[PDB]
Each structure stands twice: as C-alpha cells, then as structure tokens.
From a paper:
Tpx constitutes part of the bacterial defence system against reactive oxygen species (ROS) and, correspondingly, is upregulated when E. coli is exposed to oxidative stress.
As part of this study, the structure of ypTpxC61S was solved to a resolution of 2.55 Å in space group P64. This structure represents the “forced” reduced form of the protein, as the resolving cysteine has been mutated to a serine, rendering it catalytically inactive. All of our solution data indicate that the mutant structure and the reduced wild type structure are identical, and that the oligomeric states are the same. When superimposed onto the reduced structure, the r.m.s.d. was 0.52 Å over 163 Cα. This fits well with the structural analysis of Hall et al. who used the TpxC61S mutant from E. coli to describe the structure of reduced Tpx. The dimer interfaces are identical in the structures of reduced Tpx and [name]. For ypTpx [name] is 2.80 S, suggesting that this mutation does not induce structural instability (i.e. the value is comparable with those determined for reduced and oxidised ypTpx). In comparison, the purified [name] mutant was present only as a monomer of 21 kDa. This difference can be attributed to the changes in the strength of the dimer interface, arising from the loss of two salt bridges in the ‘forced’ reduced [name] mutant, which in turn is more susceptible to the heat and detergent experienced during the far-western blotting procedure.
Residue numbers in the entry:
A (entry chain A), B (entry chain A): 0 to 164
C-alpha cells in the first residue's frame, strides 16, 4: 500500500494511494450527479476534464475554488469542470443554486467510493478521515493525465493558472 | 440477509437489515460530531435517546423534522436528540447555524458507516442508494429500544407525538 503525506495547518495526515502523475492513465469512475443519476468518466470522452477534488464544499477554502473554476470554465475550450467531494448531491446543489454557478458539474462520492482509492485521495487518519484530500487533476479526451497536483497543505488553494495546458 | 421495503412517492426500494424493534438491545455506534470528534452512543449512558434518521438534511421533509425535534427537545426530560444522516458534519453545521437550532446534536455517517447495517437503515438500490432511510428510534438509559418507526414512505414525516413514552 502506497502512502502520501499532506497536512492541515501543520499536522501530518496520511493519504491512501497516490495521485496519478504525468503520463499515467486515469481510472474510469462513476459518481452521483445533482439529479441522483450515476455519471461515468466515459461519458465525457473526447472532452478535456478538470477534476477539482476537495474535502467539503461547505468549508471556506473549497467554496472559493468551485467559484473560481466556474468563472474560468467559460474561458476554457472543449473542457468540462467536475467538482468532486465527499459531500452529498444535495449539499452540492444548494451551494451552486444559491451562488448562481452553472458552468461546473458537481459529482458526489455517495456512490463510487472506490474513486478515493483509485485516484489516491482518501484521507486515512485524523479528524478529516473518510474525506477526500485537496487535489486538481487535468485530463485529456482519452483520460491520459496532463496535469496533477496534490496540495501539500489543505488551507492553501491549489494553483489555478498552472493547471492550464 | 434481511430485507425491508419502503418507497419514494410509490416506488419500492429495498433496505438492508431491519430496524431494532421493541424489546431489542440497540448496537453501540460511533459517529462524527460538528467539531469532527468521534462521539459514541456509550457517552449518553443514563440519558434517553431520540435517534432521528433521514436521507439528507438539505431535503425539504428532513429539514422540518430537525426543526420539530429541536423545539420539543426543550420539553423533553433527561433526553438528547441525535440527528443522524448521510450528510457531512459541515452540511449539518451550516443548517443548524443558520436556523438557530442548538438543542439537537448532529451526527454524521462519515465515520461509522456500519451504523447503517447494524440499525438496518441502509438503502440498497435506486437513486437513494448509499443514503439512510427515514426512521425514528427512541432508546432509554441502557440502550434498550422503547420505540422504533420505519416510515413506509420517504415524503411523509415520521410520527412525533407517538414517539413519546
């Protein structure tokens, strides 16, 4: 079993598996949409993917990342932004409905919990155990990894400008 | 494996296990609190428990039940109301913080997913799969079941007045 290390403020927390690095082929996942429908990664074939992985959408830092990726989604070409978290579809829907975000597509780990182990983002120990770590993974049309970032510390935002290819 | 049957509007959905009926001894569970601390059922020993189990706190019907149980919690004697759902602690905290509910204690199935199987409330199939069914379980000081209700249909509220002993 592979082990990664991130932190909250300054507290080492173990992450199961490893984030798919450059050149690797990302595993096909199936997650719950806003209308409780199972949406797979294979449905976005031919289109570029930006996977925004965060602990919870109700937290302060992660709420800013969804709003940021929503605004730059209109600037992107042939790209769909997929906000993935441990939140339920209802918690993700009430946020996007109140903030007026329509460009992003929310995905829930309610069904498809194996996503955490396949992408190496599952938090093993601590108070954040069971949640997903802060990560940004950029994919092409054929699910090949072009960009992948595992943010060393949870409180700081991932790099949005470097995610561009 | 035992199988129970409830529905959404009029669509039969299978529930794994069975709700602990009258006379049975309820299993000890450990769930996540609002401050990300693991709180067990053994911590409320000597006190009477009212377990409010619902799919999601962001849904319309379940939001009314939490508000109802919060108002009658001040009327109850030696009783703690535990709102249990598949929601994250952050989604439960933002609701109670905005509505001004303080009498209820929110518990998350983020850690302690075995609660669903032990109490027989896990939804097996359909769009609501992975979530908890609508149930109200009343316990005494020694975790013995005094009242238990599995609401036949999700959209209708559980009986609050009959839950009193």
């Amino acid at each position: 079993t592979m082990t990664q290390t991130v932190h909250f403020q300054g507290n080492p927390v173990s992450v199961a598996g490893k984030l798919p690095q450059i050149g690797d082929k990302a595993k096909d996942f199936t997650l719950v949409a806003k209308d409780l429908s199972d949406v797979a990664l294979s449905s976005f074939a031919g289109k570029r993917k930006v996977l925004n992985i965060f602990p919870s959408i109700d937290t302060g830092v992660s709420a800013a990342s969804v709003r940021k990726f929503n605004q730059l989604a209109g600037e992107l070409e042939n790209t769909v932004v997929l906000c993935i978290s441990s939140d339920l579809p209802f918690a993700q829907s009430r946020f996007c409905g109140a903030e007026g975000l329509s460009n992003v597509i929310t995905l829930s780990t309610l069904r498809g919990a194996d996503f955490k182990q396949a992408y190496g983002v599952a938090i093993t120990e601590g108070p954040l155990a069971g949640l997903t770590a802060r990560a940004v993974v950029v994919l092409d049309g054929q699910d090949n990894v072009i960009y992948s970032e595992l943010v060393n510390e949870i409180t700081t935002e991932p790099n949005y400008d470097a995610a561009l290819a």
